[PDB]
Amino acid sequence: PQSLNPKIIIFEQENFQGHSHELNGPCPNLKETGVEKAGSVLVQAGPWVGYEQANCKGEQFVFEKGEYPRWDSWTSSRRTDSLSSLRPIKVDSQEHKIILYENPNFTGKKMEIIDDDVPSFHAHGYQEKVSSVRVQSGTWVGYQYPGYRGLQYLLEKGDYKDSSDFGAPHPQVQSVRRIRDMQWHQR
Amino acid sequence: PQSLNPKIIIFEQENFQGHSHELNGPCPNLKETGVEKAGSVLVQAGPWVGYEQANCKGEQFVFEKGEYPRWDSWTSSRRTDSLSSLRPIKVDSQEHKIILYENPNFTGKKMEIIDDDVPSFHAHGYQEKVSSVRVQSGTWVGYQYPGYRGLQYLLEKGDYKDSSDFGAPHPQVQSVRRIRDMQWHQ
Amino acid sequence: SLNPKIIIFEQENFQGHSHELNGPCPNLKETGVEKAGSVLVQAGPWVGYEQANCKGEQFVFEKGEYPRWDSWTSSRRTDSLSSLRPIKVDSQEHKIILYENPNFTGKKMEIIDDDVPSFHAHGYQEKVSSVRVQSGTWVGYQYPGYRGLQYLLEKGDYKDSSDFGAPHPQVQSVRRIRDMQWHQ
Amino acid sequence: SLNPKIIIFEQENFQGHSHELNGPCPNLKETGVEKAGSVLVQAGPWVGYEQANCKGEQFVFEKGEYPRWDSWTSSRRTDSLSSLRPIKVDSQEHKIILYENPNFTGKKMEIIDDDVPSFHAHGYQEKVSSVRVQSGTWVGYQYPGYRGLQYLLEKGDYKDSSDFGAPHPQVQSVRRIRDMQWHQ
């Protein structure tokens, strides 16, 4: 699997100086938990939203992975230099993803494809066989040879534990394209 | 017009001659149709996937809107010219959509945004105040000024029937950008 | 109007005496607006600088309203706006235009950047008798989903479907060749 | 300069005496392979033709394995492959390259067409000392989320952070300017 946690470090002074407080979840008053004023901020896993006042109140500031070495780096209109609450953001991402694997059962070298078509696997990382596919979203056709030639393999949302599962007489797939358009409305 | 059902016609002979059969839903046997051997195919609403053997098993051919005048046109790797079952493909495609409204409670002029950041609402014609916002999907950041300058309003899925709802002192939003990435999991 | 247009005001919220520029201004003292209070951009984008002759802190203005000096300085190192100019944006496409009748007559399809697996799905069910590739490298195919005969279509003009190697004038799909692993 | 290379083999599945090609060959008779059974492309793409001197049915080969005659021709009334040439592809894409050290040296970052709100999120936590803008109009920013000092980056070279107006060599986000409203 993967369970990476949100990870923001708020320092006491500007330029990553003084006492560091690592936070991994929502914090409705940062004064109460130790750090009373936050001088810099380092996001290692976000994004995060800061707010002006405790209890997710007032001016919002959005933190993404990177260094925020002063107060003014996160806040234009400076009602305050302060930062009272924080919470991780939890994004909605409807990006069409397919992930193709070297070995059966979702093992070995992989290639993730997001939204785009791929007329040549060799022109990416991948010169290996393709033995399993996870379609996390979208509708794809895989093909044996590059530029969408040879046998067609329709890949729709689901797991494909072995190459036979998606119709392959052997585990060879060198190009993929996404099916984007339907000419009729569904339920 | 605009179709409410897939539309594929299969012909007995090549170049769209002979007895046609119009399918508008799955067919696990194409012998039933009286078009036992399809010689051509015309997709009017698709896409469709045909199969080599009945009940959707064997070699696959994805047919998209257009003319397929001969058996060869759809099976490059000509192990067979058989075509024994056809079914519509149920195409999964999600978007990320936000809609921002001139006047409170989801009324007045409205600007839809899909997937893309928008650094100038003025450049999308929209010069009006933004009083209410409906976020369908995706995670957005509205700004007061163009080029993602000024006060930030995080706009997540659901409804904001006034501008005070998304933390605005006045109903002014002039740029919006999607947040695409996360580095953490539930 | 084919005109870059930025109006600076002397005061905030678009009050006081306006000076409307329609081209570069390397010193804003030779306007009637010593320091700019607010800015409005009707055609852009523009870039301002903190000191004269496009020197110092840079601020990029896009079409819209900037009702205060701090609405455009992320850094308040300065409020000063001492030079402006329009930004001529470099924006390139790949364009191919296919045509129903020979010699670039009849109903036409303009493709830009994107592959097009079904010509019928775009509203074009006509024959393709001539092609004019303006930029990019494309492959047209007889049938949808890049099926059938291939015709490499490169920059330049194809007055008859025989000039791109078609036996009859049928194309129902195009893709762009995007990547090259060699260089000269 | 990387160099175009395709290998044609005398039999299927990359068996038999192989031949490397590195430029236009108008007749594979002067190939000790008088017919090819398979084809591997390492640097492409290549367009091949049914007859000598680049005539008849066209076939576009991209990087990868083509283990039989039928892997590259859809409608066969010929299995022959009698001429090859590289394709010079025209990719008018918007590209910017940001380097760790001055004069275009150290760990680098290429951005094509798309904006980048967080450099850290692309695994670039290094300083940015020099910048090469091949095509497009870009604004670089000190902080993530198009915040801090703005640096307008247009077509050309920046051998040092000082050149694009940076007091210190920190860039943590880029966006591309796409739209203009003047001289169309």
XYZ file of C-alpha atoms in Angstrom:
741
model
C 0.000 0.000 0.000
C 1.070 3.607 0.937
C 0.176 5.644 4.130
C 2.461 8.757 4.025
C 1.200 11.354 6.608
C 0.978 15.166 6.322
C 4.201 16.866 7.618
C 4.573 20.631 8.313
C 7.448 21.958 10.529
C 6.785 25.476 12.043
C 9.951 27.209 13.420
C 10.069 29.997 16.132
C 12.244 32.440 14.005
C 12.723 33.404 10.305
C 15.148 31.362 8.064
C 14.517 27.933 9.826
C 16.048 29.108 13.196
C 14.983 28.477 16.856
C 12.695 25.637 18.129
C 10.989 23.373 15.427
C 7.462 21.912 16.001
C 6.538 18.988 13.606
C 2.674 18.788 12.965
C 0.938 15.773 11.188
C -2.831 16.666 11.518
C -5.302 19.564 12.180
C -4.331 22.011 15.001
C -7.059 24.511 15.954
C -4.719 26.592 18.254
C -0.898 26.502 17.656
C -0.238 28.882 20.633
C -1.804 26.260 23.007
C 0.388 23.344 21.704
C 3.771 25.201 22.178
C 5.016 27.380 19.241
C 3.311 30.791 20.100
C 4.523 32.715 16.999
C 5.683 30.958 13.760
C 8.677 32.694 12.071
C 9.267 30.266 9.145
C 7.423 27.095 7.820
C 8.758 23.965 5.985
C 6.097 21.731 4.249
C 7.450 18.216 3.441
C 4.036 16.634 2.821
C 1.009 18.832 2.009
C -0.758 20.779 0.973
C -1.819 22.589 4.190
C -4.128 25.583 4.785
C -3.040 28.086 7.481
C -5.605 30.542 8.982
C -5.260 33.958 10.731
C -7.193 33.235 13.970
C -7.649 30.000 15.993
C -10.486 27.508 15.075
C -9.949 27.851 11.221
C -11.050 31.543 11.228
C -10.269 34.583 9.044
C -7.669 35.210 6.274
C -6.690 31.836 4.665
C -3.113 31.002 3.455
C -2.427 27.794 1.355
C 0.947 26.030 1.955
C 2.363 23.567 -0.630
C 5.633 21.541 -0.416
C 8.511 23.992 -0.079
C 10.271 26.536 2.187
C 8.351 29.561 3.589
C 11.327 31.335 5.203
C 9.446 34.438 6.538
C 5.929 35.533 7.669
C 5.390 37.688 4.519
C 6.086 34.752 2.095
C 2.626 33.229 2.953
C 0.512 36.445 3.576
C 0.003 39.364 1.067
C -2.476 41.579 3.055
C -0.825 41.568 6.530
C -3.784 42.067 8.971
C -1.466 39.854 11.036
C 1.954 38.140 10.629
C 0.412 35.317 12.763
C -0.795 31.814 11.845
C -3.188 30.373 14.501
C -4.621 27.099 13.056
C -3.374 24.635 10.399
C -4.957 21.574 8.730
C -3.838 19.245 5.924
C -5.958 19.891 2.802
C -6.960 16.466 1.299
C -7.388 17.224 -2.445
C -10.011 15.894 -4.945
C -8.153 14.538 -8.011
C -10.220 13.072 -10.900
C -7.064 12.487 -13.048
C -7.322 9.344 -15.260
C -4.534 6.960 -14.164
C -3.417 3.517 -15.455
C -0.300 1.747 -14.038
C 1.333 -1.077 -16.039
C 3.633 -3.632 -14.277
C 6.566 -5.831 -15.534
C 5.647 -8.978 -13.477
C 2.225 -10.513 -12.784
C 0.392 -9.514 -9.550
C 1.452 -5.836 -9.587
C 5.205 -6.414 -8.917
C 8.517 -5.333 -10.510
C 9.207 -2.281 -12.730
C 6.115 -0.069 -13.361
C 4.983 2.888 -15.560
C 2.170 5.280 -14.443
C 0.238 7.042 -17.221
C -1.908 10.121 -16.321
C -4.524 11.453 -18.818
C -2.062 11.390 -21.826
C -1.623 8.855 -24.652
C 1.774 7.024 -25.062
C 2.586 5.926 -28.639
C 5.961 4.367 -27.540
C 6.827 2.677 -24.228
C 10.538 2.478 -25.329
C 10.578 6.348 -25.637
C 9.595 6.389 -21.917
C 11.431 4.219 -19.293
C 9.916 0.981 -20.366
C 11.419 -1.846 -22.597
C 10.232 -4.664 -20.259
C 7.274 -7.060 -20.790
C 3.853 -5.902 -19.326
C 2.373 -8.732 -17.161
C -0.284 -6.891 -15.050
C -2.301 -3.598 -15.310
C -4.240 -1.609 -12.643
C -6.710 0.893 -14.208
C -7.430 3.303 -11.380
C -9.692 5.503 -13.613
C -10.524 6.152 -17.320
C -10.854 3.886 -20.428
C -7.675 2.740 -22.235
C -6.723 0.536 -25.233
C -3.295 -1.106 -25.044
C -1.590 -2.383 -28.206
C 1.273 -4.850 -28.804
C 3.415 -2.539 -30.982
C 4.160 1.215 -31.031
C 1.821 3.779 -32.696
C -1.251 1.742 -31.670
C -0.535 -1.325 -33.936
C -1.028 -5.091 -33.445
C -3.667 -6.666 -31.139
C -5.997 -4.305 -29.169
C -6.542 -4.753 -25.361
C -9.461 -2.721 -23.889
C -8.474 -1.721 -20.279
C -11.324 -0.370 -18.044
C -11.445 0.450 -14.262
C -10.281 -2.635 -12.329
C -7.209 -4.853 -11.687
C -5.728 -7.254 -14.373
C -3.568 -9.675 -12.272
C -2.001 -11.438 -15.347
C -1.560 -10.512 -19.075
C -4.169 -13.242 -20.055
C -6.769 -11.358 -17.950
C -6.797 -8.461 -20.569
C -6.547 -10.813 -23.601
C -2.794 -11.019 -24.255
C -1.385 -14.285 -25.748
C 1.928 -13.136 -24.076
C 2.737 -10.014 -21.936
C 3.747 -7.501 -24.731
C 2.327 -3.933 -24.766
C 4.274 -1.051 -26.343
C 1.665 1.777 -26.654
C -1.537 2.943 -24.874
C -4.205 5.570 -25.686
C -7.114 6.813 -23.570
C -10.772 6.756 -24.832
C -11.936 10.310 -24.149
C -15.351 10.776 -25.888
C -18.746 8.988 -25.867
C -21.395 10.301 -28.419
C -24.378 9.390 -26.060
C -25.311 10.420 -22.427
C -25.186 7.683 -19.663
C -27.102 7.263 -16.310
C -29.740 16.209 -32.707
C -27.889 14.258 -29.840
C -28.127 10.427 -29.264
C -29.500 8.828 -26.033
C -28.196 5.340 -27.083
C -25.184 3.871 -28.903
C -25.723 3.312 -32.706
C -23.701 0.774 -34.740
C -25.058 -0.653 -38.070
C -23.455 -3.912 -39.387
C -23.865 -4.817 -43.151
C -23.658 -8.345 -44.701
C -21.434 -7.164 -47.617
C -18.471 -4.748 -47.879
C -18.978 -0.978 -48.575
C -22.335 -0.859 -46.679
C -24.320 -3.089 -49.163
C -26.645 -6.015 -48.296
C -28.945 -6.551 -45.268
C -28.076 -4.046 -42.467
C -28.793 -4.565 -38.727
C -28.759 -1.446 -36.377
C -27.689 -2.386 -32.787
C -28.490 0.082 -29.904
C -27.216 -2.096 -27.069
C -25.078 -5.172 -26.363
C -25.280 -8.306 -28.646
C -23.680 -11.571 -27.324
C -24.436 -13.360 -30.664
C -24.504 -11.533 -34.080
C -25.831 -14.673 -35.814
C -29.261 -13.725 -34.143
C -29.228 -10.424 -36.140
C -29.331 -12.240 -39.543
C -25.980 -10.518 -40.250
C -23.939 -13.715 -39.399
C -20.802 -12.326 -41.148
C -20.419 -8.516 -40.991
C -18.745 -7.318 -44.249
C -18.730 -3.623 -43.261
C -19.559 -1.556 -40.097
C -20.850 2.056 -39.605
C -20.628 3.568 -36.051
C -22.927 6.588 -35.609
C -22.805 6.667 -31.759
C -19.980 4.841 -29.943
C -17.480 3.809 -29.147
C -18.050 0.055 -29.327
C -15.815 -3.015 -28.806
C -16.412 -6.048 -31.101
C -15.063 -9.557 -30.157
C -13.840 -12.584 -32.249
C -16.065 -15.251 -30.522
C -19.597 -14.987 -29.015
C -20.344 -13.683 -25.433
C -17.447 -11.125 -25.594
C -14.450 -13.587 -25.577
C -11.308 -13.729 -27.830
C -9.513 -11.064 -29.972
C -10.869 -7.428 -29.507
C -11.581 -4.549 -31.994
C -12.564 -1.025 -30.651
C -14.888 0.730 -33.208
C -15.217 4.559 -32.901
C -17.591 6.897 -34.857
C -16.941 6.432 -38.622
C -16.843 4.121 -41.675
C -15.251 0.594 -41.530
C -15.903 -0.435 -45.128
C -14.079 -3.867 -45.139
C -13.302 -6.590 -42.571
C -9.522 -5.646 -42.735
C -10.250 -2.012 -41.559
C -10.872 -3.227 -37.941
C -8.590 -6.352 -37.516
C -4.975 -5.366 -38.505
C -3.604 -8.636 -36.965
C -5.793 -10.736 -39.303
C -5.932 -14.089 -37.418
C -9.762 -13.961 -38.181
C -12.432 -11.764 -39.966
C -15.134 -13.231 -37.600
C -17.096 -10.729 -35.444
C -19.470 -12.582 -33.095
C -20.420 -10.109 -30.294
C -20.539 -6.303 -30.029
C -21.148 -4.038 -27.042
C -20.964 -0.303 -26.274
C -17.924 0.877 -24.222
C -19.010 2.746 -21.069
C -16.378 5.513 -21.200
C -15.135 6.688 -17.760
C -14.056 10.373 -18.023
C -14.152 12.649 -14.951
C -13.575 16.442 -14.956
C -12.898 18.979 -12.183
C -15.514 21.726 -12.349
C -16.099 24.949 -10.366
C -18.916 27.473 -11.073
C -18.661 31.076 -9.714
C -21.826 33.271 -9.639
C -22.406 37.116 -9.853
C -25.178 37.318 -7.167
C -25.656 35.371 -3.896
C -27.461 31.970 -3.844
C -26.196 30.656 -7.235
C -27.783 33.336 -9.488
C -26.857 36.121 -11.985
C -24.036 35.675 -14.549
C -22.024 32.431 -13.976
C -18.493 31.308 -15.072
C -17.819 27.520 -15.264
C -14.108 26.499 -15.054
C -13.103 22.899 -16.006
C -9.656 21.467 -14.952
C -7.656 24.572 -16.012
C -6.224 27.398 -13.880
C -7.573 30.850 -14.908
C -5.188 33.770 -14.106
C -7.583 36.504 -15.457
C -11.419 36.287 -15.128
C -11.406 39.578 -17.176
C -9.779 37.587 -20.053
C -12.683 35.022 -19.826
C -15.119 37.941 -20.294
C -16.146 37.794 -16.575
C -15.656 41.326 -15.062
C -18.646 40.956 -12.597
C -18.379 40.534 -8.771
C -18.314 36.839 -7.559
C -20.942 36.590 -4.713
C -21.466 32.754 -4.610
C -19.507 29.612 -5.752
C -20.567 25.940 -6.309
C -17.574 23.482 -6.327
C -18.612 20.220 -8.070
C -15.209 18.449 -7.921
C -11.473 19.331 -7.566
C -9.742 21.624 -5.000
C -9.527 25.313 -5.992
C -7.882 28.565 -4.709
C -9.671 31.807 -5.604
C -7.694 35.101 -5.387
C -8.886 38.805 -5.246
C -6.580 39.931 -8.106
C -5.335 38.419 -11.393
C -2.109 36.344 -11.408
C -3.043 34.657 -8.054
C -2.389 37.898 -6.072
C -4.246 39.177 -2.929
C -6.495 37.306 -0.457
C -6.785 33.501 -0.902
C -10.109 31.603 -0.681
C -9.771 27.785 -0.496
C -12.877 26.391 -2.289
C -13.452 22.624 -1.725
C -16.415 20.431 -2.972
C -19.932 21.702 -2.090
C -21.636 25.116 -1.901
C -20.807 28.749 -0.816
C -24.135 30.700 -1.206
C -22.399 33.987 -0.191
C -18.790 35.361 -0.538
C -18.530 35.658 3.323
C -18.942 31.780 3.242
C -15.466 31.393 1.535
C -13.892 34.105 3.759
C -14.211 37.153 1.448
C -14.662 40.725 2.797
C -16.233 41.730 -0.590
C -17.363 39.488 -3.512
C -14.111 39.998 -5.541
C -12.384 36.967 -7.176
C -10.287 37.589 -10.362
C -8.061 34.406 -10.645
C -8.605 30.707 -9.688
C -6.092 27.770 -9.815
C -6.656 24.079 -9.165
C -4.554 22.242 -6.505
C -3.631 19.036 -8.430
C -1.226 17.182 -6.090
C -1.189 15.774 -2.546
C 1.825 14.097 -0.763
C -0.314 12.240 1.870
C -2.889 9.355 2.033
C -5.818 8.539 4.515
C -8.343 47.124 -31.120
C -4.763 45.668 -31.631
C -3.438 47.921 -28.903
C -1.748 47.174 -25.507
C -3.761 49.299 -23.010
C -2.914 49.994 -19.305
C -4.441 52.953 -17.359
C -2.522 54.000 -14.199
C -4.319 56.343 -11.730
C -2.705 58.745 -9.173
C -4.914 57.455 -6.314
C -6.219 54.097 -5.097
C -9.545 52.568 -6.324
C -9.181 54.233 -9.801
C -9.594 57.901 -8.580
C -7.501 61.021 -9.340
C -5.852 61.840 -12.696
C -5.497 58.820 -15.098
C -2.674 58.414 -17.693
C -3.558 55.737 -20.372
C -0.469 54.079 -22.047
C -0.706 52.217 -25.421
C 3.048 51.343 -25.709
C 6.253 51.253 -23.550
C 7.056 54.117 -21.054
C 10.661 53.903 -19.675
C 9.995 56.844 -17.206
C 6.546 57.602 -15.607
C 7.603 61.145 -14.440
C 7.008 62.210 -18.129
C 3.357 61.196 -17.463
C 1.005 63.255 -15.173
C 1.138 60.456 -12.485
C 4.282 60.736 -10.233
C 3.504 57.528 -8.250
C 0.675 55.124 -9.334
C -2.112 54.564 -6.772
C -4.154 51.987 -8.793
C -3.851 50.263 -12.243
C -6.401 48.834 -14.781
C -5.313 46.593 -17.722
C -7.770 46.336 -20.688
C -5.250 44.676 -23.052
C -2.006 42.985 -21.818
C -0.101 41.500 -20.246
C 2.375 44.215 -19.128
C 5.465 44.217 -16.857
C 6.305 47.155 -14.501
C 9.713 47.793 -12.811
C 10.569 49.568 -9.486
C 13.258 51.931 -11.097
C 13.430 53.702 -14.543
C 14.470 52.037 -17.859
C 13.011 48.597 -16.850
C 15.464 48.139 -13.844
C 14.632 46.720 -10.332
C 11.717 44.683 -8.749
C 9.408 43.218 -11.553
C 5.558 43.094 -11.307
C 3.552 41.322 -14.138
C 0.071 42.873 -14.726
C -2.663 40.809 -16.508
C -6.061 42.071 -17.762
C -8.087 43.124 -14.715
C -8.252 45.517 -11.747
C -5.360 46.413 -9.316
C -7.130 48.845 -6.925
C -4.020 49.413 -4.607
C -0.134 49.529 -4.865
C 0.201 46.404 -2.560
C -2.225 44.349 -4.782
C 0.835 44.048 -7.152
C 3.870 44.061 -4.780
C 4.124 40.564 -3.170
C 7.345 42.090 -1.685
C 6.764 45.542 -0.207
C 10.438 46.441 -0.822
C 8.747 49.282 -2.874
C 5.397 50.808 -4.082
C 7.298 52.746 -6.835
C 6.328 52.011 -10.471
C 8.959 53.770 -12.666
C 8.674 51.856 -16.042
C 6.006 49.691 -17.792
C 5.969 47.727 -21.080
C 3.720 45.250 -22.915
C 4.982 41.604 -22.924
C 4.872 40.128 -26.464
C 4.074 36.516 -25.426
C 5.761 33.671 -27.406
C 2.880 31.183 -28.002
C 3.446 28.497 -30.691
C 0.974 25.827 -31.936
C 1.084 22.873 -34.363
C -1.633 23.352 -37.028
C -2.805 21.097 -39.926
C -5.780 21.998 -42.181
C -7.393 19.173 -44.244
C -9.716 20.111 -47.188
C -12.654 18.301 -48.924
C -11.785 19.178 -52.583
C -8.367 19.336 -54.299
C -6.347 22.591 -54.295
C -7.586 23.750 -50.834
C -11.310 24.318 -51.605
C -14.501 23.106 -49.879
C -15.395 22.251 -46.280
C -12.282 22.084 -44.090
C -11.032 20.767 -40.738
C -8.480 22.778 -38.655
C -6.637 20.564 -36.160
C -4.446 22.317 -33.508
C -1.908 20.422 -31.259
C -4.266 17.512 -30.491
C -4.721 14.013 -31.983
C -8.172 13.312 -33.514
C -9.084 9.611 -33.585
C -12.552 10.064 -35.171
C -13.086 12.696 -37.906
C -16.831 11.828 -37.864
C -16.854 12.599 -34.115
C -15.616 16.224 -35.001
C -18.390 16.729 -37.595
C -16.262 15.925 -40.692
C -17.711 12.993 -42.716
C -16.458 14.359 -46.106
C -13.565 13.052 -48.227
C -10.104 14.647 -47.656
C -8.701 15.646 -51.126
C -6.023 18.243 -50.075
C -3.971 18.975 -46.855
C -1.905 22.033 -45.723
C 0.501 21.296 -42.796
C 1.595 24.686 -41.346
C 3.623 23.318 -38.360
C 4.237 19.958 -36.583
C 4.521 16.443 -38.062
C 1.321 14.383 -38.479
C 0.062 10.941 -39.555
C -3.364 10.783 -41.215
C -5.022 7.320 -41.497
C -7.809 5.905 -43.750
C -10.011 4.651 -40.872
C -10.774 5.818 -37.318
C -8.486 4.904 -34.401
C -5.339 5.216 -36.581
C -6.342 2.119 -38.632
C -5.575 1.481 -42.363
C -3.072 3.149 -44.660
C -0.718 5.803 -43.138
C 0.149 9.150 -44.765
C 3.056 11.091 -43.162
C 2.003 14.754 -43.565
C 4.871 17.253 -42.905
C 5.107 21.101 -43.223
C 4.031 22.208 -46.747
C 1.043 21.787 -49.120
C -0.614 18.652 -50.695
C -2.882 19.889 -53.536
C -4.249 16.372 -54.398
C -4.717 13.290 -52.104
C -2.243 11.518 -54.487
C 0.512 13.969 -53.246
C 0.404 12.453 -49.679
C 0.080 8.926 -51.175
C -3.703 8.190 -50.904
C -5.269 5.836 -53.537
C -8.664 7.550 -52.989
C -9.162 10.730 -50.848
C -10.268 9.146 -47.476
C -8.795 10.142 -44.032
C -10.786 9.574 -40.781
C -7.994 10.072 -38.115
C -4.799 12.092 -37.485
C -2.180 12.041 -34.738
C 0.794 14.360 -34.228
C 4.363 12.947 -33.952
C 5.497 14.695 -30.717
C 8.959 13.167 -29.915
C 12.376 12.845 -31.680
C 15.373 10.969 -30.113
C 17.877 12.539 -32.634
C 19.222 16.126 -33.149
C 20.881 18.320 -35.874
C 24.177 15.040 -30.874
C 22.229 11.735 -30.478
C 21.951 10.060 -33.951
C 19.071 8.280 -35.735
C 19.482 4.452 -35.596
C 17.155 1.631 -36.748
C 18.353 -2.010 -37.094
C 16.688 -4.259 -39.769
C 17.177 -8.103 -39.259
C 16.929 -10.870 -42.001
C 14.205 -12.894 -40.042
C 11.363 -12.387 -37.457
C 11.886 -11.909 -33.639
C 15.357 -10.233 -34.114
C 17.008 -13.391 -35.669
C 19.560 -13.428 -38.561
C 22.279 -11.007 -39.826
C 21.321 -7.489 -38.533
C 22.075 -4.097 -40.247
C 22.280 -0.648 -38.573
C 20.937 2.425 -40.493
C 21.859 6.020 -39.427
C 20.447 8.087 -42.314
C 18.404 7.967 -45.537
C 18.825 4.677 -47.466
C 16.803 4.776 -50.743
C 17.293 0.979 -51.536
C 17.757 -1.860 -48.951
C 19.128 -4.027 -51.853
C 22.554 -2.591 -50.788
C 21.328 -4.099 -47.468
C 22.786 -7.707 -47.345
C 19.198 -8.120 -46.006
C 17.275 -8.135 -49.369
C 14.108 -8.546 -47.266
C 13.777 -7.595 -43.541
C 11.675 -9.861 -41.277
C 11.894 -7.631 -38.189
C 12.964 -4.067 -37.250
C 14.177 -2.435 -33.949
C 14.189 1.409 -33.666
C 16.493 2.894 -31.005
C 16.464 6.521 -32.248
C 13.510 7.720 -34.325
C 11.097 8.103 -35.627
C 11.614 6.650 -39.111
C 9.197 6.485 -42.123
C 9.624 3.403 -44.394
C 8.191 2.905 -47.939
C 6.954 -0.172 -49.897
C 9.090 0.611 -53.009
C 12.598 2.040 -53.592
C 13.289 5.827 -53.633
C 10.513 6.571 -51.012
C 7.420 5.552 -53.144
C 4.133 3.640 -52.518
C 2.667 2.568 -49.114
C 4.196 4.495 -46.095
C 4.863 3.049 -42.608
C 5.921 5.249 -39.626
C 8.233 3.451 -37.145
C 8.709 4.860 -33.597
C 11.129 3.752 -30.798
C 10.426 0.044 -30.057
C 10.318 -3.584 -31.327
C 8.552 -4.541 -34.640
C 9.024 -8.333 -34.513
C 7.193 -9.252 -37.804
C 6.199 -7.752 -41.225
C 2.535 -7.401 -40.100
C 3.487 -5.315 -36.983
C 4.087 -2.296 -39.329
C 1.677 -2.768 -42.335
C -2.168 -2.892 -41.705
C -3.358 -3.568 -45.327
C -0.741 -5.916 -46.947
C -0.561 -6.076 -50.737
C 3.238 -5.888 -50.009
C 5.464 -7.185 -47.115
C 8.533 -5.493 -48.769
C 10.301 -2.536 -47.056
C 12.490 -0.912 -49.766
C 13.398 2.579 -48.400
C 13.867 4.154 -44.913
C 14.654 7.686 -43.719
C 14.656 9.504 -40.361
C 11.766 11.930 -39.702
C 12.798 15.459 -38.755
C 9.852 16.222 -36.367
C 8.630 19.852 -35.867
C 7.759 20.248 -32.151
C 6.909 23.921 -31.497
C 6.658 23.088 -27.712
C 7.200 25.685 -24.877
C 10.329 24.658 -22.899
C 12.313 26.286 -20.012
C 15.386 24.767 -18.197
C 16.470 25.897 -14.704
C 19.967 24.902 -13.473
C 21.500 24.651 -9.977
C 24.821 26.439 -10.803
C 25.683 29.495 -12.965
C 26.414 29.103 -16.717
C 23.945 26.118 -17.078
C 25.618 23.465 -14.823
C 24.674 21.150 -11.902
C 21.275 19.476 -11.261
C 18.669 20.721 -13.826
C 14.831 20.983 -14.202
C 12.963 21.002 -17.608
C 9.376 22.322 -17.734
C 7.368 21.787 -20.982
C 4.141 23.856 -21.597
C 2.752 23.315 -18.051
C 2.865 25.427 -14.819
C 4.678 24.163 -11.633
C 3.414 25.471 -8.246
C 6.017 23.533 -6.092
C 9.631 22.715 -7.197
C 10.050 20.633 -3.988
C 7.008 18.600 -5.161
C 9.017 17.725 -8.371
C 12.066 16.766 -6.196
C 14.063 19.980 -6.957
C 15.123 21.431 -3.535
C 18.377 22.954 -4.976
C 19.059 26.689 -5.573
C 18.312 28.044 -9.123
C 21.428 29.966 -10.420
C 20.896 30.082 -14.250
C 17.872 29.677 -16.584
C 17.526 28.833 -20.353
C 14.161 29.785 -21.984
C 14.061 27.931 -25.344
C 10.465 29.025 -26.171
C 7.447 30.577 -24.338
C 6.910 33.416 -21.780
C 7.482 32.425 -18.116
C 7.310 34.089 -14.697
C 9.604 32.585 -12.018
C 8.788 33.136 -8.284
C 10.835 32.817 -5.031
C 8.171 30.800 -3.140
C 5.605 28.079 -3.937
C 2.152 29.264 -5.207
C 3.456 32.104 -7.467
C 4.445 34.115 -4.307
C 7.390 36.377 -3.388
C 9.481 38.275 -5.972
C 8.394 37.769 -9.642
C 11.050 37.238 -12.371
C 9.781 37.569 -16.008
C 11.719 35.007 -18.107
C 11.533 35.296 -21.910
C 13.279 33.585 -24.804
C 17.060 33.650 -24.189
C 19.779 32.720 -21.645
C 20.260 33.822 -18.001
C 23.883 32.799 -17.023
C 23.270 34.096 -13.442
C 20.344 34.669 -11.011
C 21.435 38.388 -11.040
C 20.484 38.494 -14.806
C 16.725 37.770 -14.161
C 16.762 40.269 -11.218
C 17.245 37.848 -8.252
C 19.031 39.156 -5.112
C 19.649 35.433 -4.193
C 19.317 32.276 -6.418
C 15.914 31.042 -5.070
C 13.066 30.002 -7.500
C 10.347 27.624 -6.117
C 7.528 27.982 -8.766
C 7.071 28.878 -12.490
C 3.934 29.615 -14.527
C 3.765 30.111 -18.315
C 1.988 33.199 -19.748
C -0.308 31.805 -22.512
C -2.662 34.709 -23.477
C -2.068 38.099 -25.223
C -4.848 40.654 -26.161
C -2.645 42.904 -28.416
C -1.536 42.694 -32.104
C -3.743 39.508 -31.793
